[PDB]
Design an enzyme around this catalytic site. Sequence first.
Site, PDB file in Angstrom:
ATOM      1  N   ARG A  70       0.708  -1.317   0.000  1.00  0.00           N
ATOM      2  CA  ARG A  70       0.000   0.000   0.000  1.00  0.00           C
ATOM      3  C   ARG A  70       0.737   1.370   0.000  1.00  0.00           C
ATOM      4  O   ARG A  70       1.362   1.672  -1.003  1.00  0.00           O
ATOM      5  CB  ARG A  70      -1.170  -0.055   0.990  1.00  0.00           C
ATOM      6  CG  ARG A  70      -2.377  -0.834   0.367  1.00  0.00           C
ATOM      7  CD  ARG A  70      -3.103  -1.675   1.360  1.00  0.00           C
ATOM      8  NE  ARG A  70      -3.465  -2.980   0.796  1.00  0.00           N
ATOM      9  CZ  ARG A  70      -4.393  -3.787   1.328  1.00  0.00           C
ATOM     10  NH1 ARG A  70      -5.046  -3.392   2.428  1.00  0.00           N
ATOM     11  NH2 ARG A  70      -4.681  -4.980   0.786  1.00  0.00           N
ATOM     12  N   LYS A 218       0.954  -2.251 -10.618  1.00  0.00           N
ATOM     13  CA  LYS A 218      -0.249  -1.431 -10.617  1.00  0.00           C
ATOM     14  C   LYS A 218       0.107  -0.103 -11.303  1.00  0.00           C
ATOM     15  O   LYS A 218      -0.672   0.441 -12.022  1.00  0.00           O
ATOM     16  CB  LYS A 218      -0.741  -1.248  -9.170  1.00  0.00           C
ATOM     17  CG  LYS A 218      -1.102  -2.614  -8.516  1.00  0.00           C
ATOM     18  CD  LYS A 218      -2.031  -3.351  -9.454  1.00  0.00           C
ATOM     19  CE  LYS A 218      -3.334  -3.699  -8.812  1.00  0.00           C
ATOM     20  NZ  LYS A 218      -3.537  -5.146  -8.692  1.00  0.00           N
ATOM     21  N   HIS A 238      -9.145  -3.303 -14.360  1.00  0.00           N
ATOM     22  CA  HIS A 238      -8.846  -4.188 -13.218  1.00  0.00           C
ATOM     23  C   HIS A 238      -9.726  -5.417 -13.362  1.00  0.00           C
ATOM     24  O   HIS A 238     -10.562  -5.754 -12.503  1.00  0.00           O
ATOM     25  CB  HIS A 238      -9.055  -3.407 -11.919  1.00  0.00           C
ATOM     26  CG  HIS A 238      -8.455  -4.058 -10.723  1.00  0.00           C
ATOM     27  ND1 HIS A 238      -7.413  -4.958 -10.810  1.00  0.00           N
ATOM     28  CD2 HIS A 238      -8.742  -3.948  -9.426  1.00  0.00           C
ATOM     29  CE1 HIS A 238      -7.075  -5.352  -9.599  1.00  0.00           C
ATOM     30  NE2 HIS A 238      -7.892  -4.785  -8.746  1.00  0.00           N
ATOM     31  N   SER A 260     -12.698  -7.511  -4.686  1.00  0.00           N
ATOM     32  CA  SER A 260     -12.376  -8.557  -3.698  1.00  0.00           C
ATOM     33  C   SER A 260     -10.929  -9.048  -3.974  1.00  0.00           C
ATOM     34  O   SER A 260     -10.497  -9.258  -5.140  1.00  0.00           O
ATOM     35  CB  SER A 260     -13.508  -9.641  -3.614  1.00  0.00           C
ATOM     36  OG  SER A 260     -14.885  -9.109  -3.597  1.00  0.00           O
ATOM     37  N   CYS A 262      -8.595 -11.612  -4.290  1.00  0.00           N
ATOM     38  CA  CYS A 262      -8.794 -13.055  -4.441  1.00  0.00           C
ATOM     39  C   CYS A 262     -10.260 -13.500  -4.553  1.00  0.00           C
ATOM     40  O   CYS A 262     -10.515 -14.695  -4.574  1.00  0.00           O
ATOM     41  CB  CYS A 262      -8.050 -13.893  -3.343  1.00  0.00           C
ATOM     42  SG  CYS A 262      -8.000 -13.346  -1.478  1.00  0.00           S
ATOM     43  N   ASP A 285      -6.108 -10.335 -12.842  1.00  0.00           N
ATOM     44  CA  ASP A 285      -5.884  -9.075 -12.200  1.00  0.00           C
ATOM     45  C   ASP A 285      -6.099  -7.844 -13.120  1.00  0.00           C
ATOM     46  O   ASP A 285      -6.862  -6.906 -12.830  1.00  0.00           O
ATOM     47  CB  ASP A 285      -4.515  -9.048 -11.499  1.00  0.00           C
ATOM     48  CG  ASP A 285      -4.446  -7.938 -10.439  1.00  0.00           C
ATOM     49  OD1 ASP A 285      -5.295  -7.950  -9.485  1.00  0.00           O
ATOM     50  OD2 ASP A 285      -3.553  -7.058 -10.577  1.00  0.00           O
ATOM     51  N   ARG A 377       1.824 -12.905  -0.044  1.00  0.00           N
ATOM     52  CA  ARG A 377       1.704 -13.155  -1.475  1.00  0.00           C
ATOM     53  C   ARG A 377       2.489 -14.392  -1.872  1.00  0.00           C
ATOM     54  O   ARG A 377       3.542 -14.663  -1.282  1.00  0.00           O
ATOM     55  CB  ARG A 377       2.227 -11.962  -2.279  1.00  0.00           C
ATOM     56  CG  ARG A 377       1.586 -10.593  -2.035  1.00  0.00           C
ATOM     57  CD  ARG A 377       0.251 -10.608  -2.629  1.00  0.00           C
ATOM     58  NE  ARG A 377      -0.614  -9.552  -2.185  1.00  0.00           N
ATOM     59  CZ  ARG A 377      -1.290  -8.803  -3.028  1.00  0.00           C
ATOM     60  NH1 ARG A 377      -1.166  -9.068  -4.335  1.00  0.00           N
ATOM     61  NH2 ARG A 377      -2.103  -7.831  -2.569  1.00  0.00           N
TER      62      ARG A 377
END
Lengths: 586, 586
Positions: A70, A218, A238, A260, A262, A285, A377
């Site tokens: 993040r 990302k 996405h 969500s 996953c 993804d 991960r």
Amino acid sequence: APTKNKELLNWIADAVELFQPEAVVFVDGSQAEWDRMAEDLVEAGTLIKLNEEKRPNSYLARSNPSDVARVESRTFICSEKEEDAGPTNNWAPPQAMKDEMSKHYAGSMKGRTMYVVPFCMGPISDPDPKLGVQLTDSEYVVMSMRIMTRMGIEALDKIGANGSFVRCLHSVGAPLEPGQEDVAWPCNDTKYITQFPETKEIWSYGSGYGGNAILAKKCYALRIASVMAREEGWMAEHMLILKLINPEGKAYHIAAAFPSACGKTNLAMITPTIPGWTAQVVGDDIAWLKLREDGLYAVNPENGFFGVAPGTNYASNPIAMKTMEPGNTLFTNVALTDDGDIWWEGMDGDAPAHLIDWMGNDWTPESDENAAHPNSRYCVAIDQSPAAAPEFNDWEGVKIDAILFGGRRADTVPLVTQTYDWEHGTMVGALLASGQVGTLRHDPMAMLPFIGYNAGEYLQNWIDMGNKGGDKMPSIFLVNWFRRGEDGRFLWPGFGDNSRVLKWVIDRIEGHVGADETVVGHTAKAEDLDLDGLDTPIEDVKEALTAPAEQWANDVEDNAEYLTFLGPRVPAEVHSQFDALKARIS
Amino acid sequence: APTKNKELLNWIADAVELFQPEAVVFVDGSQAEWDRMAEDLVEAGTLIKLNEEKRPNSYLARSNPSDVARVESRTFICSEKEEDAGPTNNWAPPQAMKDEMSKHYAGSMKGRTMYVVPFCMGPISDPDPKLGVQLTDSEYVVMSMRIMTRMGIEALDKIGANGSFVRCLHSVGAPLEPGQEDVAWPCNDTKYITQFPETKEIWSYGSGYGGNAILAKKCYALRIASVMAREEGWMAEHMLILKLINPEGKAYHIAAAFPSACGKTNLAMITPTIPGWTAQVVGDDIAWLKLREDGLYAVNPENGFFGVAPGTNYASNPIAMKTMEPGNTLFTNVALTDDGDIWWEGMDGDAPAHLIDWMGNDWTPESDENAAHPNSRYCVAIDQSPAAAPEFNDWEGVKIDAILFGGRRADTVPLVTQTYDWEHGTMVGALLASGQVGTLRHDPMAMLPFIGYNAGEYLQNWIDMGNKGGDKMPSIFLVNWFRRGEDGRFLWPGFGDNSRVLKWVIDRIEGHVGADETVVGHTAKAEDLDLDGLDTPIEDVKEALTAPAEQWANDVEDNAEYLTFLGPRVPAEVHSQFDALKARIS
């Protein structure tokens, strides 16, 4: 230095002067190069090599606890004008963020080597592919990048002598002094991730973790890609891409946008629970789509899975577990067993009675803190998957037949509904959210943290594509798997049973239909649904299929507020679809 | 000019040069001046005068939907160093920010008057007051400042020839050319709120609304003020201040941080439900606290209430209603009756057949859309409250006897529980969360959008304060009005009856009631509460006072990640109290 590209080299050249690395190394993307790096990082402390007869060629990274995901408050869209970042983005002045960042970059690589990582964002055989180069001091990022992109010599050749590329700068911000001992996971208390849309640069600082550090993930594939898709006439999204093959053997492809973590992965890799249906994954993804003239086509710009570990298991994702079975996986902040294997919460056993947790501490199940971090991960290559779609590496893309949006809602949103048309579809995406004013958690297109420009213009991109595009756009659906009974129980079992919802979808777009109309749109009639084997027989929780108009009335004001929030570029067309929605509930 | 203050005169000269207003007008604070501005604004179509026979000297403002709250996305704490802004704040480099904004400020007051609004933060009787001056092009801002602060010539005479002040600049960003007609609510699609902590200046642009424009409220009262507090050894907090007088005799004062507005509003203006307890409001929003000789003392820096109007009635908050019954209220974005009174949702005056909504459209109780915007406000003088504590205007403050922290939790958190000491209380505020995994919605100290510097360093301020004050520190409590039974209904009636809780806080302070030890601390035994009358709760009360250790063990990972999130200035003291909490939880 296998390149004659003058831009490439001057840029590298200014970087070395600023960063001051001890040495510079062009990465080739070879297996020897990976082995060499594994052993450097095993010698550093950074990676722990996993038991070789459990999991060959497999490693665990434990990160500094404060560098584990993040950093939203320090992620900036630095367009020239504040309004091109828009309300859903952070912004700060582009040059002064460059100046701010060089103050930090200056000398950041001293005592360390600077790797030059060429990379390409989809099949290398595309005649005209999106491309980048990353400068980084992290061999970890170099290894992750090996799995997540086409990295190395083939992509340096694609850039070529004169080709262009997104330029990525990255330093973990932990210069060394001579004869100075290093840490397992280097990093800085100052962390920045800055995108500069005009110039197509991405500059990160202070973070060796996932998305802050793997600038392909990302920052490129969504944030910058989205601007390129805006400037050029396509869509970066996405979305998971799934391929569904029926008993007759016809292939259909489904893009789906879910917040969500996953949620996406467990459908991207679904095993159909209905006889004769199989499915293959194209990506879980990110999906880049453009209009070919006979439809919308998607490619996956990624070369690997970088999935949340917790909750992954043989009941809930056997395909993800069968992918990590050959090994060849980087795990990050998961637990370690006494066998030198890995564990996480949600795994198929009983929790083992001892582990070493992602922090390096002895762990027993009576700990109330998790053995593997919530954001932990796996990172494994897509073509290792037994359900990897044969055409996932093919530049032609796959024709999209249906797009799904969904969130978790306990009420209100039926299990599955077909939208009227793309413009309607664009509105339903805009309002996408989770929950049961201020109470719904809004995630327009499941893109909220990833729109790289003005979010209202981003909805105008949607409108543009549907017009530019016409009757060749696929139908948009709204799903929700999380309706709850008055009791509180989940109504729809989910997991492999969502294949029954996906068949319904396939059965609509062809026309073996059955919809009885709601405020939300054309919704499953609920015995046009293959329900053989489920809960216990006679069944028919059609409650999951209600959209009780009082529930929709309850949401009207919040939804009205949110569209205003989204700003002056929200298309006239989205507001009108929203009027109509309110006419319909009223 | 009424001032010989040369720092002040330079500063206006400079803004005048930049802004290019048609006129500069120093604002006096008088009633005639307010009258004359309401007449201007009624003419500008900005306000509507309400029925004088029903609401004397009161007005409705209606804002453009585009500026209805918000702009957290563009609210910046511009410290020179980014970590002085820290992980709960947006950051942008100071100088770079002055230039962006000067690019917008350049010429924005063309065609308009620059108002010079001298102001005092707190009792005007204070020998060293916090003072401020705001330059604005909005007479609605000046009007609002007169309710909300001690404004005008008195304040400018306190500044004097040599007094310091906070410099607050504001333009709506709507300059008017020679031809150009005005709009009822001017503003700009580009909005910015920048605090410069070092220089103690606040710059606002593009919004006329609430806390975007009223620079005393929030920007000065909490953000700038917490910087000062940290630099000078005191505290600026987001607490109501309540006077509670017990049967025959004694006056207590309770401060309370709740992440709400109306949760706090409802407690500050509580009318007790138990025989002989009377309650009076000192403040309902911001508290400035400072250690004196025998304790911690609090001033309300504000002069006015600025509370959320929807939900406000004679059953939930009759003191709120009676404060307003005399008039002199400035309402923003509430609804408007056919004969000139106002209405909002939750008014006791159920379904009028027709209203004009805060957007100018006719509204029926068929609409699915609110008549009053949900963040709609009344602004009214504290002076006017029938329940106002006479001492709210004392410069020496009120002695605090207990401090309450509370969030909205359906489970886990007991109805009321006492913390062990100041350092424990401090960890309990750090972790304050609501919801109404990663699913707690944290608000440490009910401060999260308001801390003007590094959040962990702000926790470090509480700690340092506990250390200076020692045993003169008020007992900290954790309350929870919002707990729910197995059927989804509330266990505690709250509203007037939270007085029963307030009485136990008091009995507990004085040592006349024991306690059940929980993981939380000393929670009330049900048998030590009530007073009868309770109106129908059985010992559902007992259920609400529960602290089941599974629900607590559930939140441990969450809370652990959050203390990590708050960063490397999080005191060791806070981590140590959290370890102790994990210990009690097993």
